[PDB]
């Protein structure tokens, strides 16, 4: 086993894992659609109820047993060993669209290396059609079919989505995005080449630039005409909509996929920690840091929105209707092209996006690699770099389908379905296992003998009452509500829902298959097999 080394390494790695690309455009948007200033209370409630205890439990499991995601079950619950393969499949499905969004951001950064930004005027080969929507104009030329040159640069030059008719017509592959994905994957391979020490060394700088970048973005957007409108519209308490459950479900899913428990990353990260560490303080600090980073990201996004609304003389909640990764590459691109320092600020913002994506990518890939290597110790002598290269090649082959012209449809499909009930039921199975199958008393005794004190009664009752019920509530809310996805001028067909359900079930289906395999492979009667499937084996 290898040691993290310095204390800052593990903290920076967990911070870069928690602070992802999702919390910069999705969190402020769903906070706007859900109350606004009144969205903070349910956010922190759902956090302290089901994201902080899960984070603490996962960190304690990773630090105590010192294993990945396939060998911990060998020590707590052998019947739930398929969670490792489920985590691998989920992480591959996530890494596909994550790396393709990283490639989009890298291509934007490369195209933002000129004096004049290419998404500024409507004189290019990609800015072809409707271009009445502009900035710094007294004439009000409003059209129901109009658009902006930035959306044309995004959808016709970067994505080239006009060369496809939807999910049913996927043809051609953009070579520029392919080269961007290749360069990004080489960077990833060189970042987790040797092991966790080089990963921490790259995170030391990759997880630090976004913070000063957000500081610069805040001090720029604060000194903009009309940002106060966006500020007061983001911090507008609307308790009338808080009566429904949709705001609660959105806040719960947001804090879950932001903190990221049950993804198989915290276990491997804490596997290298020392036995005399303090995982509670680390978990609390990283959770508060991720929450504050989400807050500042929403703040700068809404200041940009308010400045653009003031300079456009248009009400809020209409300039950024479309969600997804396009929100940034359209709205923030227009705002930067409107700013005097366009090239520098665009380069800075795209470097921030690249670093935020790379942090989570490194975290997930290292977690998967550690989970696989902890299960098969015989492939750790002279197969580490080979397995890392194989994982990178598999991720590249999985993202190749999203790197097409109409690939953005598959990207949204993966971002909306892979981040669905699969991770939720994985975390639920883990929680109920540690609670009943492994025993909450034994877990508390392990936490006491590891740190030096047992956790308070709050976490003890929470892990057994709230977090499993909270995850089950999210599951039953996501199951009976099929998402109605819609990209730019395209409604998803009915078979898209079936494909999303299939790709979300194929990752979860590993657990019951492994349960059946374990129940058949061991001799004895039924109850004897059940008993043998819960009690851990001898070391």
């Amino acid at each position, epitope marked *: 086993r290898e040691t993290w080394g310095k204390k800052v390494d593990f903290l920076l790695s967990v911070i870069g894992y928690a602070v992802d690309l999702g919390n910069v455009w999705r969190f402020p948007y769903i906070c706007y659609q859900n109350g606004g200033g009144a969205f903070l209370l349910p956010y922190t409630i759902m956090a302290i109820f089901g994201g902080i205890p899960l984070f603490y439990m996962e960190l304690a499991l990773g630090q105590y047993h010192r294993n990945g995601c396939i060998s911990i079950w060998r020590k707590i619950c052998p019947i739930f060993k398929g969670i490792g393969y489920a985590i691998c499949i989920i992480a591959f499905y996530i890494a596909s669209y994550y790396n393709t969004i990283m490639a989009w951001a890298l291509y934007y950064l490369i195209s933002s290396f000129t004096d004049q930004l290419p998404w500024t*005027s*409507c004189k290019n080969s990609w800015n*072809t*059609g409707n271009c009445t929507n502009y900035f710094s104009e007294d004439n009000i030329t409003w059209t129901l079919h109009s658009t902006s040159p930035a959306e044309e640069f995004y959808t016709r*030059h970067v994505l080239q989505i006009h060369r496809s008719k939807g999910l049913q017509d996927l043809g051609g592959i953009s070579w520029q995005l392919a080269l961007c994905i290749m360069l990004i994957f080489t960077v990833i391979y060189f970042s987790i080449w040797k092991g966790v020490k080089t990963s921490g060394k790259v995170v030391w700088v990759t997880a630090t630039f976004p913070y000063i970048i957000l500081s610069v973005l805040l001090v720029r957007g604060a000194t903009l005409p009309g940002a106060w409108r966006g500020v007061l519209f983001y911090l507008k308490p609307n308790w009338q909509k808080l009566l429904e459950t949709g705001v609660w479900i959105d806040a719960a899913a947001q804090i879950f996929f932001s903190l990221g428990p049950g993804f198989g990353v915290l276990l491997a990260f804490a596997s290298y920690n020392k036995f005399n560490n303090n995982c509670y303080q680390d978990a609390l600090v990283t959770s508060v840091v991720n929450c504050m980073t989400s807050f500042v990201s929403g703040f700068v996004i809404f200041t940009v929105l308010g400045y653009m609304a003031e300079m456009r003389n248009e009400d809020v909640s209409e300039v950024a209707k479309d969600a997804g990764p396009s929100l940034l590459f359209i709205t923030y691109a227009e705002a930067i092209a409107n700013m005097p320092a366009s090239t520098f600020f665009a380069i800075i913002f795209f470097l921030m996006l690249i670093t935020l994506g790379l942090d989570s990518t490194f975290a997930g890939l290292e977690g998967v690699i550690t989970a696989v290597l902890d299960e098969f110790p015989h492939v750790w002598a002279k197969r580490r770099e080979r397995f890392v290269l194989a994982v990178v090649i598999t991720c590249f082959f999985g993202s190749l389908v999203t790197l097409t012209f109409g690939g953005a449809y598959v990207v949204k499909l993966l971002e909306e379905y892979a981040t669905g009930p699969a991770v939720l039921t994985v975390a639920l199975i883990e929680a109920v296992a540690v609670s009943w199958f492994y025993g909450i008393t034994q877990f508390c005794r392990d936490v006491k003998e590891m740190l030096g004190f047992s956790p308070g009664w709050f976490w003890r009752i929470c892990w057994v009452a709230i977090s499993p019920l909270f995850l089950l509530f999210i599951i039953c809310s996501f199951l009976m509500s099929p998402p109605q996805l819609r990209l730019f001028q395209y409604n998803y067909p009915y078979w898209s829902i079936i494909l999303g359900y299939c790709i979300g079930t194929s990752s979860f289906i590993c657990i019951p298959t492994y349960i059946a395999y374990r129940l058949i492979i061991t001799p004895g009667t039924f109850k004897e097999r059940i008993i043998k499937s819960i009690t851990p084996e001898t070391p």
Partner: antibody
Amino acid sequence: QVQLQQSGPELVKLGASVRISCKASGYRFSYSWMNWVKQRPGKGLEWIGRIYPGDGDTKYSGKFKGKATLTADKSSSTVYMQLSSLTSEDSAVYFCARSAYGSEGFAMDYWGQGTSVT
Amino acid sequence: DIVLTQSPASLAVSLGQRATISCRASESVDNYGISFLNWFQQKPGQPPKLLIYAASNQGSGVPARFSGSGSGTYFSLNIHPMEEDDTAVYFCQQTKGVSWTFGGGTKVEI
């Protein structure tokens, strides 16, 4: 409806300078390129250069890089062309073709009557 | 700078037949799915008139007899059936983002 009204013809002089205008009307003047071509008597067309009145970006292909000056005027929707070092080779008919959008491949569909510089 | 070589230099076919005008570009003019190559037509004493844009779609007031096709670095202009009103000079201009240059021009007679 799009109509590009061009000026009348002028007289070429050795070492002088001529300014040919093109009064475009009927479309978004600041959202479409305004190209210029050269048709010598008895020979084919010769592209001069384009100018985008939205921001004033001008392009040139060949020899007309340092002798042709394209200026835009959004107030009156008129594009000018300042020719310099007028020789016997510049005695041709300079048209004013409005390029289409990108989906149409920048099609120069609407042209002018041409000013025969004799 | 992308040069264009039109073939042949002169064309002379009877009425009612099919006239084929080729235009081989030096480089590729397709980058965003659409072709950046147009076809024009001019008569003695008349400014040029656009016939087909993007080498696939026809103009506004152009008859259906001017059918265009081709992609990549080879394009064709089909005029069938042609009459005594289609005897003019047909050019081939590309609109690539590096330079917009014209072709050679084919004087179709008869």
